[PDB]
Amino acid sequence: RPDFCLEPPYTGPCKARIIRYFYNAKAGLCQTFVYGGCRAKRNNFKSAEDCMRTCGGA
């Protein structure tokens, strides 16, 4: 996996509730989290397919 797929999902300091996918590397699955709307990190996907292609492995 890229390193960044192992990082926790980052809500950040803004107060939107935007539902995004992250790769949960402990589960081996892309899952939802709540993104606050600014200062996104890389383990933050608008779709499950995006997340799987980047983080789900060979």
UniProtKB/Swiss-Prot annotation:
It is found in: Secreted. Residues 5-55 form the BPTI/Kunitz inhibitor domain. GO terms for cellular component: extracellular space; serine protease inhibitor complex. The record marks 15-16 as: Reactive bond for trypsin. Disulfide bonds join 5-55, 14-38, 30-51. One of its GO terms (molecular function) is protease binding. Transmembrane segments: none annotated. One of its GO terms (biological process) is trypsinogen activation. Keywords: Disulfide bond, Pharmaceutical, Protease inhibitor, Secreted, Serine protease inhibitor, Signal. Inhibits trypsin, kallikrein, chymotrypsin, and plasmin. This is Pancreatic trypsin inhibitor. It comes from Bos taurus (Bovine).
